[PDB]
Amino acid sequence: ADILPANYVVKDRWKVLKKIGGGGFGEIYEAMDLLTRENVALKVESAQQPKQVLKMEVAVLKKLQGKDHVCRFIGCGRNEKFNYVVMQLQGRNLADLRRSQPRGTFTLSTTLRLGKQILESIEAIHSVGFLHRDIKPSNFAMGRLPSTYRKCYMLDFGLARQYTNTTGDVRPPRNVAGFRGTVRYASVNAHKNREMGRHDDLWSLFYMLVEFAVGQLPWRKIKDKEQVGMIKEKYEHRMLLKHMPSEFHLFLDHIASLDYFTKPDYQLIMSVFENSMKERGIAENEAFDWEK
Ligand SMILES: COc1ccc(Nc2ncnc3[nH]ccc23)cc1
């Protein structure tokens, strides 16, 4: 049922080595670039499959070229059987790296430094007029080169949505928008099927960094979407910060104050991370938990 067989060659250039991921919206392959001789990421979707995401992914990936924390764009194409995008291959995703930790926790050093990079990548996609809407650990990975192994990349844009027109004006929100992302990291606004805003990506970041440093979220073992939403709407989020740096109260307070229309203060949130490293002599050049 795989779209491309192993050893299949795309545009006489990209040779499929293996499927490395998959899900109801298309597949991702590791391929060899027969010209440049490096391995690459190859995302494919059926020409027929009713929801066409790669048109989204490619448009966002091209807009973001020249930013840190995004994959170099290599190529894209259509034909009778599938569409495809070729981009830079990255290393281990943050969900695998977290799971691999003894306590399923990152140190605060690793946590805070990932927060700075992920926040940059969130400000970057917002700056070109798109919401991510699916901020989660498996949507980031570390590099796999001497030049990148300490850099964190935003991998996928398949749920993204333009929140501007051509002019930089915020589009009108729909009265109802069926939330589509991952349950664990979704904001209360998404659970309520409200139009998501820039702040909803920052809610997802907030939940991810808590889960990083503390190893779990209170709703971890609930898979039912409505249940998770009802738990989150009640839950005293200062309890999440019990065992986090207190500067995170500023992060929480700020994003809780935002609405769909309001531009977040990203420098406020960048400050929270940097100050938190400062008060603790965490260095920008320290080993990540998974090295040594
Ligand atoms: C096992 O779960 C996975 C999560 C993420 C990805 N994605 C990518 N992996 C590497 N390099 C990549 N460039 C662009 C996307 C991409 C693959 C598998």
d(CA 252, CA 203): 8
The maximal CA–CA distance of the chain, rounded, in angstroms, is 58
Q: How many CB atoms lie within 10 A of CB 72?
A: 13
Helix (H) or strand (E) holding 243: none
Residues catalogued as catalytic: 134
User: Rounded to the nearest whole angstrom, what is the distance from the C-alpha of residue 249 to the centroid of ligand 1?
Assistant: 32
Is the Cα dihedral 76, 65, 153, 252 positive or negative?
A: negative
CA count, 13 A, side-chain hemisphere, 35: 7
- Length reported for the chain: 292
Return the closest-CA partner of residue 255 out of 191, 189, 203: 203
Q: Which amino acid is residue 46, in one-letter code?
A: S
Residues 6+ positions from 119 with CB-CB distance below 8 Å: 205, 266, 269, 270, 273
Shortest-distance Cα residue to atom 4 of ligand 1: 138
Contact by Cβ (8 Å): 67, 93: no
Technique used to solve these coordinates: X-ray
Contact by Cβ (8 Å): 13, 34: yes
Contact by Cβ (8 Å): 21, 27: yes
Number of helical H runs and strand E runs in the chain: 8, 10
Resolution for the entry shown, Å = 2.0
Distant-in-sequence contacts of 283-288, Cβ < 8 A, 24+ apart: 284/113, 286/109, 286/113, 288/110, 288/113, 288/142, 288/150
User: Rounded to the nearest whole angstrom, what is the distance from the C-alpha of residue 191 to the centroid of ligand 1?
Assistant: 26
- The answer to whether the annotation marks 157 as part of a ligand binding site is no
Find residue 16's DSSP bridge partners: 31
Contact by Cβ (8 Å): 73, 42: no
- Strands 130-131, 73-77: pairing is unpaired
d(CA 182, CA 198): 16
Return the closest-CA partner of residue 90 out of 151, 135, 132: 151
Start-to-end C-alpha separation, the chain: 41
Contact by Cβ (8 Å): 92, 145: no
Return the closest-CA partner of residue 233 out of 266, 192, 193, 265: 192
- The answer to whether the annotation marks 3 as part of a ligand binding site is no
d(CA 9, CA 34): 9
Residues 6+ positions from 209 with CB-CB distance below 8 Å: 111, 114, 115, 244, 248
Alpha helices (H) along the chain: 54-63, 94-100, 108-127, 188-191, 198-214, 225-234, 248-257, 266-278
Residues 6+ positions from 257 with CB-CB distance below 8 Å: none
Find residue 33's DSSP bridge partners: 14
Which residue ranges make up each domain of the chain? 17-30+41-90, 91-292
d(CA 143, CA 69): 9
- The answer to whether the annotation marks 27 as part of a ligand binding site is yes
- Give the C-alpha distances (Å, rounded to integers) separating 152 from 40, 54, 58, 112, 214: 17, 22, 20, 12, 20
Shortest-distance Cα residue to atom 15 of ligand 1: 155
